[PDB]
Amino acid sequence: GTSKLKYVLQDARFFLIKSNNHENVSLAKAKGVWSTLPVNEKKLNLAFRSARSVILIFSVRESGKFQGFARLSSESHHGGSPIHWVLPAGMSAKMLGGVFKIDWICRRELPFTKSAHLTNPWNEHKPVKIGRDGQEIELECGTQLCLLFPPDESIDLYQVIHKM
């Protein structure tokens, strides 16, 4: 069913995450962590304190798809267990130094062709697939986007709900 999912998304905030490579999204799915540039790191830490759930919706550049979505379970923290991100061209390990813990809600893909009817008011009502890394997605758009993903029957949202 989808009732617990809708409960988790209630009054959530949503942010688009754009990764330059698949390897880092695979690492994030394996380890439950994400790192972004300092400008977006500050936005996510503020959002984490402001909302019952902060949802990251992931898309690998040039893939034509979203690869899943996850809920922040912490603010960013430095110095914990390190992470071997595959660093793009203009990217240093100090830029990805802040590590957020995340709980995956859906690890399944959604092609951009399926979200063509959703536009994001916070990005000039462009299709929700359009946006830079860190772009916030308005509540109703983000809720409908997350509900379009195939159900991930491997995930039990009971433990996620308790963190709220």
Residue 156, marked binder: no
Per CB under 6 A, which region of 3-11, 15-23, 65-73, 138-146 contacts ligand JA0?
15-23
Per CB under 6 A, which region of 4-12, 90-98, 141-149, 156-164 contacts ligand JA0?
90-98
Instruction: Determine if 90 is a binding residue for ligand JA0 (CB under 6 A).
Output: yes
Residue 122, marked binder: no
Instruction: Determine if 30 is a binding residue for ligand JA0 (CB under 6 A).
Output: no
Residue 4, marked binder: no
Instruction: Determine if 133 is a binding residue for ligand JA0 (CB under 6 A).
Output: yes
Contacts of 2 (CB under 8 A, 6+ apart): 147, 151
Residue 85, marked binder: yes
Residue 11: name the closest of 51, 46, 40, 38 by CA: 51
Based on CB atoms, which residue is closest to ligand JA0, 31 or 108? Answer: 31
Query: Applying CB under 6 A, which residues contact ligand JA0?
Result: 18-21, 24, 35-37, 85, 88-91, 96, 133
The binding site for RNA consists of 18-20, 34-35, 85, 133
